């Protein structure tokens with residue numbers, strides 16, 4: 001689709017079999033989801049935002065369907081204020097900015 | 100133009116007399132600029148994201164040019180690590196997400 005920006009670009013995603021709402025976030029390097037359970041191995045990591053740094057759990061090679069488009073990649077889980085889909089997966093689904 | 104997301108979507112902006120690089124950020128409701136001593140009235144605000152909150156100064160009806168496209172709106176000035184062009188200005192320059 002073409003998505004305008006008068007409203008937050010929120011979409012439904014499917015991950016670990018569960019539906020969630022997430023924000024398409026071109027200003028995020030990485031995909032960060034609010035606290036949740038995901039299967040398999042993870043590694044501790046840190047990421048920075050506007051307010052400083054947080055600790056996250058890094059899950060690699062995770063399938064997520066974003067607005068009907070398949071991606072498989074890194075998902076960080078931690079204290080983000082909202083679920084965000086970052087550039088690592090936005091690239092996978094062929095998302096660009098246009099004006 | 101079309102901007103892919105392999106790298107951060109940094110573009111040149113102009114505000115006041117200054118040229119800066121700024122992120123075209125669909126995850127940002129509002130535009131946040133690195134500390135600069137702009138003229139005119141402002142009001143204090145707190146804005147939050149990953150890591151917590153920072154204190155900013157809200158300036159209204161500030162002209163800004165983004166990739167040669169004229170815009171005018173609210174800018175939040177404070178100790179952000181990156182200049183962020185948020186949806187309040189992205190809509191004005193006709194920016195969409197496409198996939």
Ligand SMILES: CC(=O)N[C@@H](C)C(=O)N[C@@H](Cc1ccccc1)[C@H](O)CN(Cc1cccs1)S(=O)(=O)c1cc(F)c(F)cc1F
Nearest residue numbers: 027028029048049050082126127128129146147148149183
């Ligand atoms: C390094 C990185 O990619 N960090 C991501 C997770 C990130 O926090 N991205 C921010 C933009 C940013 C990038 C690098 C450094 C600092 C910030 C989001 O795209 C926009 N953010 C919003 C977020 C949504 C989900 C997590 S942070 S916000 O916190 O920066 C933000 C909050 C406001 F209240 C505001 F008015 C404007 C904003 F841009």
